[PDB]
Amino acid sequence: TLDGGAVAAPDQYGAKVAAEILKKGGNAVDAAVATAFTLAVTYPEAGNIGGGGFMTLYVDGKPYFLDYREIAPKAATKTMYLNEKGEVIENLSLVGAKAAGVPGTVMGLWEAHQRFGKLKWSELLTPAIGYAQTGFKVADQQYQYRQDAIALFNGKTNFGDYFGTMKPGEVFKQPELAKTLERIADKGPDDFYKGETAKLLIAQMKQDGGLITSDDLVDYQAKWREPMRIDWQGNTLYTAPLPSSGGIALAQLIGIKEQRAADFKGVELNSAKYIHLLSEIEKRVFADRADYLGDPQFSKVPVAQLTDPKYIAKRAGEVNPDAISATEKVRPGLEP
């Protein structure tokens, strides 16, 4: 088949770990699980076990998609981020415990591995545990993001208790995170959603006034979904369906650009004409994004209608190649 495997990772540690797993005979999923836990240590600004995400896969010639996006706590309400007079409360949805959805990453990595991985679960966490125990060197830009974040948090959280000792180019260790990963390696997701880690999560919600409960954690499920499929020019793109907007967005971006090929003929990449045409398409994509898209089991989302080739053709017609279309006139495309 191929000359080998490959990894493209957002830091050197994820790259190294993925490569070691491939060398040991793990498949792409084994490597992905070990990489995701590694970055939960070395890339805490985004790599995580307290967040969520999406995995797109191609295994033995077939496409798959795994949704481990966070879910609103049972106690969430439509106006929970508004004051008694209806105004949005500054940063209540962005900073502090009420900003958190129920985390899905540990469940997602488990489900992906149980279905498709080749190697023993616990050993996929040993790399990450090592980096948490013996540390990694903080990057310059990473520390800058740390500075910006701690200034934004403005003393409202316990962030500084755990990440305040980060210094650029110095080794940063995370002993409590090491133990948490050891529990996940030994017990599986049960530790996070039912066990010791789950208890520690609940205690933090009570300490900080958050909403997540034990029942929230016990009821969390990752979901396998049919990936979004987009075909053009003999290529087949598999990407994220709802609850991601990217699948429908890409289906419309590619489909409309193809319909407007004549306008793109001859125009150099990142010319003002190129950029204007992309903006004109993006106008219509985001008009539909705002009006129709959300969790697909909580409303009847007209996905087919928004990706039918005839709809794509109608929306492509709206593109104005010579001038900006009137923003207030860019409507949701299925609006009667």
Partner: protein, 194 residues
Amino acid sequence: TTHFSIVDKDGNAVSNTYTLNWDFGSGVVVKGAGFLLNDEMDDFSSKPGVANAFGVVGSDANAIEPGKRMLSSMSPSIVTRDGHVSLVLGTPGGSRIFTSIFQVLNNVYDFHLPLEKAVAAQRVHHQLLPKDTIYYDAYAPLTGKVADELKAMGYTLEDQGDNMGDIQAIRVNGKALETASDPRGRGVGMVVKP
């Protein structure tokens, strides 16, 4: 947010985007456990027509409800041709994620640029609201004649204050593998031989 891409020697592929939402999420660490909690709730529409931290709006579909998943822009992607993986890619960037991927795909498939150049190339973003506003990053800012021409058309140009993505991609060319890590970030790629 962050993204990684993996292909194994059997031709299987994983494209994985995951996140806390904003940098270090909510800033809340689980005492005793040591991990940060997300601030992913801001991806819901908190109030109809009111933009969230990425400038995107919503109403009923993306309104908060118990047990509901909040709308995402994360778009981990795998391109195939003739039943075989040909390109694995994804990126952070909030509401810029799928427009950045769109541009990389245009660079690879329409402009036929080599992978490293397609990923390093300037990317910009528009999203209807804010009105006629095009975003750029300090890595490859809009400048010179093109910026004047866009300004003259009626567009507002704005430095968004962070890099526009961090593409991590793998191209499969027959049996050969190529990686690209966005120069905007500190990523690393490796081809791994049996």
